[PDB]
């Protein structure tokens, strides 16, 4: 050992075993909480909540996190909050100044930047308790118990903590709160007396900052990145954001418009969110409507519904479809029963027949003489994301030539209103990719064009995110150190904008997801000089 | 394209594509292991290990980590390790030299300071194998097979590798590694002969560390933060820490204090701990004294149940609690029974009641022929994380007015000894948050209050922690190549000390939980100088 | 409150709440994507795929992306890909320029460098999409749909992005991807078309880059490191890497040989790979032959197997080992059948049995007269990762003195060729650690030694893997703007060499594992000049 240790043992070396420990600048943090002013005026007469920070002694502010105060939920329906009910009940964050706004957010946008960080993804509500959904049995029922939610809103003065902080420089900072309608944050039937909840519920928030009270502050101009926001038309696949003349990056994502629908599904798998718990939840539902053991033919499915009886062999044949049913202890005087055409969408009568039973392979189980009921075990089926995505409203299309839904009063009633305000693609998981190709334009001239998401392996790789987008980053320098590396406008070539075109994949005109609208989202990233000169002021970068 | 890379292209620039790559400190690393002195003086003879580091060619060491190696568990009880079974058997580890101490912490806190490291967490023994409940069946049976456990010894000197390392100077440096009771790290039932395993079980540890073997070693002074920690008055809503001069943070949490009781509870989900697999365990282990199927009325149970039959439309009523009842093939000879009083707390006769069954909505099953018992399908119910973390002493206290515990013998024999010592909060899981208000005192003077746990989700979010506690961080500046920022006294107005004072919130005096008793835990975070001059020594900022 | 801010009220302090943002090098970054050149000119026409990056305008490029589009899989038998299909298909990876190859990888190497790359891991291939073992019906039947995974080929360049960033000093860089045959990364019956398959099969590649257009670059030297490897001889526990002479790192860990069988297993979890999903596969398939339902005695298993009537106690005893098994609702003309030796291993007659019927404590179920089998609901059993992991051709082999498998013709017809190349240890998961003495040596002199695997633990702890090997790492300086610290040789002691001995464990005293063909890998990370002088050019430390 010795003999290798005299092999180690004159050049100019860098001490890496001892640093020069430097006194940073005199400073005490402390976390400060404020209630705000509510305002509910004009537009439907939306939730606007503002706070105030106006102190002597907050020298410098970041890492802003809004609590909010979830009444108890008393009543009869069905009941539950969406995943991340904080975030997703957010419309808009803006941080201004007496020279104006330094900083704003879109709601979905907030939540796309904290969707990688699942610690503030929890503390927003992700709980069985919150989102799993609750019944009511009772008037007085407590089908909620009241919660607290913290919705962590990352701006860009956290990311390299003191350092990148918000300096107050003598001026009254005011955070503004827009609130979407709680009907967006709320997973409900029809049971549920919403109407009256919808009258009785307010949002109760709380602003909290960490504030720093800093002696003989030195301060500096910086950079900051604010998310710029286009969306659009309805199936629209354009969208152009105008004014580029330092940009960071740039994201493309789809999402879905249910206007043309009552934004009821028939499934919702409550806190349990991977896509087998989708699919789980969807199957679940439909396993009651479509095998039943019932004396003699099965009562009260629409007279468009055919319902058949299992033959001895346990295989019933609907056209190329072969569906094996076996259940166990059934008593003598009935007899085993499949639904035919559960759920069928077709645009012709000669056409191809999208049919949810065919989606069935083999469904076996065992009847219950106790509760009269059959105990499914073993269910094998091709059902996916996208069945559990498709808005109860397309079945009953007026392009679809059948009845459509062939379900149960029963089923039809355990359909659940969905209004989430942050899904993307045209799915519940946004896996389906529904971009086939993808061009951006600086000006006139194509900047990119793709035709898989190699900007969105890009963007999960570079970010080390599950959850990312079709993303082009122009900076790959250091934050805050140094001033970002943009993409950069030459106004006399008229290179002033951005354009963005897809040309989306499509399914058969007889899925009922072809039917489901879709909506372009364009997300900038402008870079801006904020000077602290008379009071917080930001200027774009041209 | 070539027209935007034309609009691609004198100022100052910093090269972002190349560096001057700096030669280090010539040094060469080392994996060093070492066995220890085994001592078992005075206090309950607790077990102390000492490990002497020092040698000519060891000039710096960091990332210390004890590997313990558990025994072969041979017997015919129920036994399985406590969940990271090799930080809870740690009581304290403590790093000095000839000068004195110059790191040392609480078994508690290392665990704590590990707790966001699910590697060293899997380490230190996370397995099916060593945290499930084992049986034995005979007196020469194997429950559970040797192992060997690692343990990340986390220390101010591993954040910046090299740079943070311990310097060892010419000094003997001496690690003393002080363990638990093996009592805490098991789990195990009455029927285990723990009498012998107490007598035989002996801690064996090995310390190993990195070490830095540096050619001319530049030595510079530097900052080490210290906890300490304070445990205040059973049920004591306060208490202090003297002496604070710079400190760089302050946490609080509460602990329970099962002293009062035998440490049994009915049930342990081992591996899987998740607050539904505490609650799934419970659960299982009530149901089959609650739900009977026998000819005719039930036997084997205190005089003191009521166990009834279920009635022909299922429905069994327990005051205003209905609970429905349906087992499948159920003999013609035999009947279905419901024990309406499982477990039962009141603290005066003929007022509220506390009884576990009414906790029931719905029990669906198949009974067995086979094997002569119910094959449970479907529960419904509302028991908590509260209820799996009651101790069975406290169901039979005597505060009880009723009997309290009306099981089978054979559910109370497999009742479990749990005494893992690092247990937060009056639940498992530290899910239930019992303190309603928050006072921190600089003096005299109110340093921060707060009612949520605001202070919490900040922890969360500042240290990217699922398990945060209430804790105030002073010091938001990097770590090493900095002077910590500070809380600091001023002597003269009598800021020495800071004071806590909580409000907890209360279960109720019929809940058995409000007979568990808390301990309050006040963690601060000390800034030290080190200097190697005469070896190494540290210097408490003042 | 105010008079602690009076309390917090001259040093030269370093300002940690501005920064003199410092203008970086003028660049613009672009995803670029290239289709290759594909070669089958030997040795055994394997694919070599060629990519020619040549451009007057990217001055440097880093994060290689390896598309591979794969095709639809038709036909009759059971077909899944395997777990991160995209990085098991490559062989080797060589960038290079007109003085040579720069940096070269082998398969496995760049595998392991990517293996707590979770989000990497993702995207070259792991779904149930793709790795589950799916079933053709029809020979026009579609198995598997066509799919694309991206495989992120990680380099030295992109540690600190633009800073360690590939330049191109005006040469054409060449990235050659070699290509492991397509069963490597295909796990199928005997029923499928391989042949047809393996013919058709054909490798569709893309390389994309992230390449950056710089304005005025000022290159620096820098340096890389090289993974280089050593496969020992089979069975031989020493390997040995020559000419090291300045090192970072050195990894060991053993590999499996399965070329003295047919690559055939009884079962594969899919896309379930924790170690509970690999027995529970195993269980399953066991379990069809294990407990029989027939009248009388059951037929179609080998005259060699032991199949016994449960009596009336429903406990069967195979030697020391009481297997309990009670099975409900059997019709009265069957009876339960129990095999006692499903599968035996000995080499000695008389003498030690592995036998697997011996590993089931209870075994508890339903038969349906429906669909006429038994549906398992408790199973307990002592089976492990091992077990699962035997080839078949070892319990047909020739050294085992009994049959060996007692199974049925169709249990037999379900096993599965699995040829996976990234398969360490001699256990699907290498869980099991078969090394007891590990031996590094620098020339002639011991430089390590070990019994249990502290080197794994560090490598653990200091990457954040849950997957780590015995690794012994030299450099701990901040990797870019340092020079890496090395092991240094002595050419004159005959420190040109790194050679490691390993003591194999016995692995049990009658296991048919201890047959498995081991071989022992060692891999040396070489430190290497990047110098710029004449075009991209690299030199071996020395």
């Given at each position: 050992?010795?003999?290798?240790?005299?092999?180690?043992?004159?050049?100019?070396?860098?001490?890496?075993?001892?640093?020069?420990?430097?006194?940073?600048?005199?400073?005490?943090?402390?976390?400060?909480?404020?209630?705000?002013?509510?305002?509910?005026?004009?537009?439907?007469?939306?939730?606007?909540?503002?706070?105030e920070?106006?102190?002597?002694?907050?020298?410098?502010?970041?890492?802003?996190?809004?609590?909010?105060?979830?009444?108890?939920?008393?009543?009869?329906?069905?009941?539950?909050?969406?995943?991340?009910?904080?975030?997703?009940?957010?419309?808009?964050?803006?941080?201004?100044s007496?020279?104006?706004?330094?900083?704003?957010?879109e709601?979905?946008?907030?939540?796309?930047?904290?969707?990688?960080?699942?610690?503030?993804?929890?503390?927003?509500?992700?709980?069985?308790?919150?989102?799993?959904?609750?019944?009511?049995?009772?008037?007085?029922?407590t089908?909620?118990?009241?919660?607290?939610?913290?919705?962590?809103?990352?701006?860009?003065?956290?990311?390299?903590?003191?350092?990148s902080?918000?300096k107050?420089?003598?001026?009254?900072?005011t955070?503004?709160?827009?609130?979407?309608?709680?009907?967006?944050?709320?997973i409900?039937?029809?049971?549920?007396?919403?109407?009256?909840?919808?009258?009785?519920?307010?949002?109760?928030?709380?602003?909290?900052?960490?504030?720093?009270?800093?002696?003989?502050?030195?301060?500096?101009?910086?950079?900051?990145?604010?998310?710029?926001?286009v969306?659009?038309?309805?199936?629209?696949?354009?969208?152009?954001?105008?004014?580029?003349?330092?940009?960071?990056?740039?994201?493309?994502?789809?999402?879905?418009?249910?206007?043309?629908?009552?934004?009821?599904?028939?499934?919702?798998?409550?806190?349990?969110?991977?896509?087998?718990?989708?699919?789980?939840?969807?199957?679940?539902?439909?396993?009651?409507?479509?095998?039943?053991?019932?004396?003699?033919?099965?009562?009260?499915?629409?007279?468009?519904?055919?319902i058949?009886?299992?033959?001895?062999?346990?295989?019933?044949?609907?056209?190329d479809?072969?569906?094996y049913?076996?259940?166990?202890?059934?008593?003598?005087?009935?007899?085993?029963?499949?639904?035919?055409?559960?759920?069928?969408?077709?645009?012709?009568?000669?056409?191809?027949?999208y049919?949810?039973?065919?989606?069935?392979?083999?469904?076996?189980?065992?009847?219950?003489?106790?509760?009269?009921?059959?105990?499914?075990?073993?269910?094998?089926?091709?059902?996916?994301?996208?069945?559990?995505?498709?808005?109860?409203s397309?079945?009953?299309?007026?392009?679809?030539?059948?009845?459509?839904?062939?379900?149960?009063?029963?089923?039809?009633?355990?359909?659940?209103?969905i209004?989430?305000?942050?899904?993307?693609?045209?799915?519940?998981?946004?896996?389906?990719?529904?971009?086939?190709?993808?061009?951006?334009?600086?000006?006139?001239?194509?900047?990119?064009?793709?035709?898989?998401?190699?900007?969105?392996?890009?963007?999960?790789?570079?970010?080390?995110?599950?959850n990312?987008?079709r993303?082009?980053?122009?900076?790959?320098?250091?934050?805050?150190?140094?001033?970002?590396?943009?993409?950069?406008?030459?106004?006399?070539?008229?290179?002033?904008?951005?354009?963005?075109?897809?040309?989306?994949?499509?399914?058969?005109?007889?899925?009922?997801?072809?039917?489901?609208?879709?909506?372009?989202?364009?997300?900038?990233?402008?870079?801006?000089?904020?000077?602290?000169?008379?009071?917080?002021?930001?200027?774009?970068?041209?």
């Amino acid at each position: 050992n010795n003999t290798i240790i005299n092999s180690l043992i004159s050049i100019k070396r860098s001490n890496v075993f001892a640093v020069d420990s430097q006194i940073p600048t005199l400073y005490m943090p402390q976390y400060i909480s404020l209630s705000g002013v509510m305002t509910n005026d004009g537009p439907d007469n939306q939730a606007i909540a503002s706070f105030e920070i106006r102190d002597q002694y907050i020298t410098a502010l970041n890492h802003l996190v809004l609590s909010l105060e979830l009444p108890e939920v008393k009543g009869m329906g069905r009941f539950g909050y969406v995943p991340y009910v904080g975030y997703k009940c957010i419309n808009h964050v803006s941080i201004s100044s007496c020279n104006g706004v330094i900083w704003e957010i879109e709601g979905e946008e907030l939540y796309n930047n904290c969707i990688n960080n699942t610690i503030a993804l929890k503390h927003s509500g992700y709980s069985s308790e919150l989102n799993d959904i609750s019944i009511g049995l009772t008037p007085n029922d407590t089908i909620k118990e009241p919660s607290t939610v913290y919705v962590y809103i990352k701006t860009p003065f956290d990311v390299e903590d003191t350092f990148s902080s918000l300096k107050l420089s003598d001026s009254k900072i005011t955070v503004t709160v827009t609130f979407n309608p709680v009907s967006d944050i709320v997973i409900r039937d029809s049971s549920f007396d919403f109407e009256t909840f919808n009258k009785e519920f307010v949002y109760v928030p709380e602003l909290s900052f960490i504030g720093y009270m800093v002696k003989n502050v030195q301060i500096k101009p910086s950079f900051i990145e604010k998310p710029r926001r286009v969306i659009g038309q309805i199936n629209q696949p354009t969208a152009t954001v105008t004014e580029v003349h330092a940009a960071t990056s740039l994201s493309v994502y789809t999402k879905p418009y249910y206007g043309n629908t009552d934004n009821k599904f028939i499934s919702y798998p409550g806190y349990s969110q991977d896509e087998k718990d989708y699919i789980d939840a969807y199957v679940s539902r439909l396993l009651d409507d479509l095998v039943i053991v019932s004396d003699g033919p099965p009562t009260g499915y629409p007279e468009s519904a055919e319902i058949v009886e299992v033959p001895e062999d346990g295989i019933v044949s609907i056209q190329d479809a072969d569906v094996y049913v076996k259940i166990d202890n059934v008593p003598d005087n009935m007899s085993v029963y499949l639904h035919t055409n559960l759920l069928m969408f077709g645009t012709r009568k000669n056409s191809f027949i999208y049919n949810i039973s065919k989606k069935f392979s083999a469904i076996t189980g065992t009847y219950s003489d106790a509760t009269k009921r059959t105990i499914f075990a073993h269910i094998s089926h091709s059902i996916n994301i996208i069945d559990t995505s498709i808005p109860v409203s397309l079945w009953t299309s007026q392009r679809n030539v059948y009845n459509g839904d062939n379900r149960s009063a029963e089923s039809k009633a355990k359909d659940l209103f969905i209004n989430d305000p942050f899904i993307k693609g045209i799915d519940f998981k946004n896996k389906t990719d529904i971009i086939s190709r993808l061009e951006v334009r600086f000006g006139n001239d194509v900047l990119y064009s793709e035709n898989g998401p190699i900007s969105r392996i890009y963007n999960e790789l570079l970010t080390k995110s599950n959850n990312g987008t079709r993303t082009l980053t122009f900076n790959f320098t250091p934050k805050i150190f140094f001033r970002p590396t943009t993409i950069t406008a030459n106004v006399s070539r008229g290179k002033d904008k951005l354009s963005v075109r897809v040309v989306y994949s499509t399914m058969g005109v007889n899925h009922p997801i072809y039917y489901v609208q879709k909506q372009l989202v364009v997300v900038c990233n402008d870079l801006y000089k904020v000077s602290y000169d008379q009071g917080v002021s930001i200027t774009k970068i041209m």
